[PDB]
Amino acid sequence: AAKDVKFGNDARVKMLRGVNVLADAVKVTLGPKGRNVVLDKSFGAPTITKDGVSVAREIELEDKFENMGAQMVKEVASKANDAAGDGTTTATVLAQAIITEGLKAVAAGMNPMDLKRGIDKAVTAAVEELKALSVPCSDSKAIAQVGTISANSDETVGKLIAEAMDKVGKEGVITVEDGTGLQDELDVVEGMQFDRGYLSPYFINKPETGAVELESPFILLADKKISNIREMLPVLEAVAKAGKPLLIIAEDVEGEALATLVVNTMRGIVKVAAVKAPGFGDRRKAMLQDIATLTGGTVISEEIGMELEKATLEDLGQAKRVVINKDTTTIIDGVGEEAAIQGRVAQIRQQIEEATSDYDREKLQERVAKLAGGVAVIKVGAATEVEMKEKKARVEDALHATRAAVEEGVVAGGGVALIRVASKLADLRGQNEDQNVGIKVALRAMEAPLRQIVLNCGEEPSVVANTVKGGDGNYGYNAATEEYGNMIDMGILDPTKVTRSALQYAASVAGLMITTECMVTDLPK
Amino acid sequence: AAKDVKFGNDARVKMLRGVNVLADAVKVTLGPKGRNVVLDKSFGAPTITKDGVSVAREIELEDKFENMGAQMVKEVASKANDAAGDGTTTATVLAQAIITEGLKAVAAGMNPMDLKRGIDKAVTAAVEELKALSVPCSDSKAIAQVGTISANSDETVGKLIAEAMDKVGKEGVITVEDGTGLQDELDVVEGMQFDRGYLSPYFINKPETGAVELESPFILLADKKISNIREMLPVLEAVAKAGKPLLIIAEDVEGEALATLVVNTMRGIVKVAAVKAPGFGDRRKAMLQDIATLTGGTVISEEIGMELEKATLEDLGQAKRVVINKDTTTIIDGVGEEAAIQGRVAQIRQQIEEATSDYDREKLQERVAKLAGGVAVIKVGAATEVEMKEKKARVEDALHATRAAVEEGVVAGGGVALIRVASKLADLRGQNEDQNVGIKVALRAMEAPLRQIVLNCGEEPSVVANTVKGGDGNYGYNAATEEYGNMIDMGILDPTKVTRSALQYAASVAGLMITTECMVTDLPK
Amino acid sequence: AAKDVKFGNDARVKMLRGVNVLADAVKVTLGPKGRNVVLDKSFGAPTITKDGVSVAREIELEDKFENMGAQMVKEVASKANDAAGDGTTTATVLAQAIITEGLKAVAAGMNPMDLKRGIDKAVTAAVEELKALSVPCSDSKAIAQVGTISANSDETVGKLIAEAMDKVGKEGVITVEDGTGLQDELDVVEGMQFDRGYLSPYFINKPETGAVELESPFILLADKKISNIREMLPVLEAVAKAGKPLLIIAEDVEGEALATLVVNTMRGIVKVAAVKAPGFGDRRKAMLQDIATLTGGTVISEEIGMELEKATLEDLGQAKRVVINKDTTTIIDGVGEEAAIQGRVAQIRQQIEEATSDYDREKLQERVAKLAGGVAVIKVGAATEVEMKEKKARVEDALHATRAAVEEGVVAGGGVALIRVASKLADLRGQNEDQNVGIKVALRAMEAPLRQIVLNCGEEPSVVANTVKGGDGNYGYNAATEEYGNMIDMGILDPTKVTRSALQYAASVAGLMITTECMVTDLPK
Ligand SMILES: Nc1ncnc2c1ncn2[C@@H]1O[C@H](COP(=O)(O)OP(=O)(O)O)[C@@H](O)[C@H]1O
Ligand SMILES: Nc1ncnc2c1ncn2[C@@H]1O[C@H](COP(=O)(O)OP(=O)(O)O)[C@@H](O)[C@H]1O
Ligand SMILES: Nc1ncnc2c1ncn2[C@@H]1O[C@H](COP(=O)(O)OP(=O)(O)O)[C@@H](O)[C@H]1O
Ligand SMILES: [K+]
Ligand SMILES: [K+]
Ligand SMILES: [K+]
Ligand SMILES: [Mg+2]
Ligand SMILES: [Mg+2]
Ligand SMILES: [Mg+2]
């Protein structure tokens, strides 16, 4: 259709309008005392919320240019959260401020690339300063403590995290599940976690966690591309009985087979999940055979001349639970017999011993760790169902943030480590006087998280940031209690990965936003 | 229906509005440091691009005549890229400059024909100057260097290309495929490349490459016109089993059979591709018999009285891989047995010895080249899949640019070769005061590529081109590094074919652009 | 429904508006250097053309009456082209000019019949002078020269055409077909050409030629009216096998059978062509029997009482090729055996010897000439198929123009012959001052073809016509090469039939609407 074409600043003004609408509706919730937003529903009582994510998801703009600006900020804030694990509203504040400063520098008629260079060098130096302020969180004590902070001072969650850390390793596979009574059960079973997510988005059945969860599902151990549903009618019909789900793990499942499987899923005939087989080429068949060994199934490949029409449930591997994430399929307690798994582990271990290549050594180490270390199974015990589910979700959140704490340490939260970075980087100067202003674009806009936190708390952002500036290291301000101090002591920590990803993605979107010289959109007809 | 009939410069101005919208949205991305253009998507995250082609694709104008000008200029820029292999945004800039100058010359009330003559003679002399400055790139070292430069300083791609042309000749068939692990495998198999593409656009299944690729496909060696589906149904039914594709290599497939095949394709019943038999008349059946020999098939001709109703899989030829381009079907590793290949090669070599006509002699040489020279197969190996695919794409791009470099040599890139040409053609005069203007219309577009490149780089284009002029030969200005020097020294090269085709098609669109005295289009109701 | 009734000059102004729009869009392309017309397309790059016919075709006007004027002026231009063989733009210019001044004179109030009389007498004297100026092209030398000139300096085409007239006679049936290699093959086979075209437009399978072409077709030799499909189903079922088309050469086919056959054609079940039997009454039966003997078929007539239900392929006649034009069906190499053809020729020859009526004997000579002279087959040989097709098209064009030259001689081309005629007819006086103005209206438009040719060539029409007038006989001006001289020397020839038909049809349409005093159209709701 006919396109509405814009160039440079006419794009930038409306994109920044989208930026500012999104961030203004979002940031009113930043911090422990965020303000209320009443997001309408088509019927009945609406929802009053104090979270930036919730308001952000309900922000849409009828104008396409403002919509593009809002979306490009929203997706990059999501990127910051994803590489971060937290700080979506913090990342939104960072993004809006840095983007606004960069664009307003641009609209003066001044070089976009020099602003991008200055902001980039500022954010690199800020990452360096945050890393210097980063105190590592690697031992089990700091793991549990950060698990409490991320779980809102919930100590039992930190204990479960550390116990899984000790059982399957901190890099090991950890899953938290439903319990039976009031007892929290953590145990290690023969499992795996290979980086292969759902092939089609319609296979997800649990919106609460956003992962594919199946109870006693058969897994399709097919080492070939799936091209005809006719290969699946016997298998699908066999799975249809007894009310048990099916997992598809294969080289690839083509379009019509995916469509038929998805149709069978919403229509309630057969519940089936499809993910790609881990690895590719030579490694894919080996890892699929490892999956078969851990799950007690048979790999179906055209190399052995095995056809999917002549595929029964025995060839399909079986597990107690299989968890499929966005890009990860975790098979928990595969019914593959223990001695079979251990014999496969030993065989690939002699493969390690015969591995004369460093890449072969590393891939075989990964394979043995995944096949033998198993998965950490956490069961949530509670009196009723709701508290069980909510504490499971809290365990998930604390695990996610503690993983970032392990990866990169923690810094004093509440934006005060960012105030440290602003205080420490007052000396940064760029290759151009245009680059210099780009540096202070990232610097002042990085004390903005604390400032919006305190503003939402109803207190004064400026005196808080200034008093933190008077302090040093991890000295800061407790916004919930409206009291200053070092928030290592008063338990306000943001993992260094969180803030680093937030600032880096704010810089990335700002730099992409600076050098935007043309715009195209559809006509609003 | 009712038509919008216009004339002359009233057409030309809407033409030029289309030209200028296209070029303004496109050229902001020209050069190594192109600026960001954010292309709207109807949903979610928009697309931020720094490539002129991507922006040109999303340029549409609601008015009929502006979209008319934009479409013909976009098409001619595509022409320049196709006869060029690169410089799509460069060709767009050149076309915009020459088109605008010629149209503004016409609207003054002065003859289109003499502008055509002057522009044509200027562009001929400019091609002459570019050829004179062109340094041949035909030895292996310059081939590798140019493939490296076009592959963005990637030597291994150029080395694979050089090995492929060492194995099958530089005129031989070079193909790149997926590998198993991380190794680059180069080998030669029994295959051919005949200039016959897909019969219908809906047979393409890989939008990334825009070619029809099938794994172990059966080919329909029918030396007859295809008119009734009743001849085709048994073949399609036989192909339906085992999930293998089908290729149709015949004289012609009529509308209804092709439509039925296309229906089968999107319905997913049978994946079938149809291509025309190479050659025509007497040579077509001989080349089809060669295809059968290399694919181990049987030619089905009405001359021998063979019908497609009685056509089984045995009569169909088989190859490991068959690649169908836009106008080229390349058979790779046809199962036609090697001794059969050598026997057919010996027979056609005897025909070479018995060839008494130069046309028949050259047809026999091209047939022996296709049959026995084989195809060069380059496998791209990588640790993962995404980098595997991007390395394959970079190999394709370096192949495309290196082929042009071999064909016509290379010139100092960055737009400085055209600056050389413009400086050397300051002496050119036309046969008229008007024809002098036509020359200056063509000549002044020469610095425009460099100038847009440097402007997009955020730097000044003017004394850049001026210092290029002060320099000699290949001296110029490095745009990405913001430095001066020599392209042959600092490695910014553009094939002579690229720039020659860009300039020639800019001239051609200018000539058609100038001399148009009437319009027809539908009413905008 | 309600009608919009209009009278006289208010009709003539809408006439002339359509006339002038059509011709102004058409004539910008007249001559060897016609200007471009970018016919804006619905999608993609628009169509750029330098032909008056092409611009004429897409000239449609939203108002009923302006489109009306465009419609009959386009009609008359096509009429002059068809009765001419060339000069669609010349006819358009002449029609527009004579219509314009005739309609203006009528709107001035001067008599319609006297304007018509003066214009008619001017144009008949113009035809007289053009005939006097026409130099005949009857010799094989002039035939070859005219074929070369009309084929744009191609002597090989002229030689092939001359050989065709030398082998089958210039009144014989000449058809050009596809070649096998590079050899131009001329041969004679057994066929007739009878002035009977396809019954329905939907049977045409070659839009490029606008004639129904069938390869080895069965022909239905039914000497009866076809009203019920129930007689036609068995014939269609028999023809459907082996993928061969059917020709219906019958007395009459009513609506139901024809519609069923047409539906069968677009549905792609059976390709069917229907042609009326040549002649009427008694002669139709004899000519159908001649066709049967030519194709080895059997006449199916109700007089013998044989029906189409029991009509098999044996009763159907067979020919190697049957060409069905708009009002002509040419059967080429009918499989009717040569001795049968010669026996029928001898029988019709003795009928000639027994003929006692001049009309009867003339029909007898027509029958013997068509049956025994056969059809001439010319094969176009070329290295590639596309150049083969364009050479075949140029052969057809040179054939038509040479036939026109043989029919009415040749005149000095470039539009100088009408200049000669206008110079010679300056003395022509009418029966009235109105008829003198009627004479002057046709006289002045004579130089308009040359003037438009030279204008589009970018040169000076006035000085060209002046130097033509200063010269004598065939002295003129080369518009493409920008040179004066004798047109016979520079090989610029137009058939006298072309210009005569153009001017005569221009006068016809002008005088027709000159005498128009009422007009009705439908309301534009
Ligand atoms: N009591 C507190 N004092 C100071 N800062 C706090 C306090 N509680 C939370 N914060 C800070 O506020 C931020 C939380 O903001 P929030 O509204 O949760 O946005 P998001 O959901 O995107 O993280 C964290 O980065 C944290 O450092
Ligand atoms: N470092 C550099 N210095 C000077 N010129 C460069 C440099 N890098 C690329 N170029 C020039 O920029 C052009 C690339 O422009 P590009 O954006 O790719 O347009 P297109 O896609 O139409 O080729 C090339 O012709 C090359 O000569
Ligand atoms: N070199 C030339 N010099 C003068 N007249 C020419 C030359 N070439 C072609 N012509 C004239 O131009 C006319 C061609 O017009 P054309 O565009 O074919 O109109 P149409 O399609 O209606 O015949 C011919 O009648 C011929 O007399
Ligand atoms: K909050
Ligand atoms: K670029
Ligand atoms: K023309
Ligand atoms: Mg948070
Ligand atoms: Mg390029
Ligand atoms: Mg003509």
Numbering used by the authors:
A (entry chain K), B (entry chain L), C (entry chain M): 2 to 526
From the paper:
GroEL is a cylindrical complex of around 800 kDa containing two heptameric rings of 57 kDa subunits stacked back to back. The apical domains mediate substrate protein (SP) binding and the equatorial domains mediate ATP binding and hydrolysis. ATP-dependent binding of the lid-shaped GroES (a heptamer of 10 kDa subunits), capping the SP-containing ring (the cis-ring), results in the burial of hydrophobic surfaces on GroEL and displaces the bound protein into an enclosed chamber.
EL–ES1 complexes were further classified based on the positioning of the apical domains of the GroEL trans-ring, resulting in two conformations referred to as ‘narrow’ and ‘wide’. No SP density was observed in the wide trans-ring, nor was a narrow state without bound SP resolved. Indeed, the apical domains in the narrow state expose the functionally critical hydrophobic residues in helices αI and αH, forming a continuous furrow for SP binding, whereas in the wide state the coherent binding surface was disrupted. GroEL without bound GroES is below detectability and may exist only transiently. By contrast, asymmetric EL–ES1 with and without bound SP on the trans-ring is abundant, defining the main SP acceptor state (Fig. 5(ii)). In WT cells, EL–ES2 complexes are also functional. Conversion of the EL–ES1 trans-ring from a wide conformation to the narrow, SP-binding state (Fig. 5(ii–iii)) appears to be limiting for EL–ES2 formation (Fig. 5(iii–iv)), because the ratio of EL–ES1 wide to EL–ES1 narrow correlates closely with the overall EL–ES1 to EL–ES2 ratio.
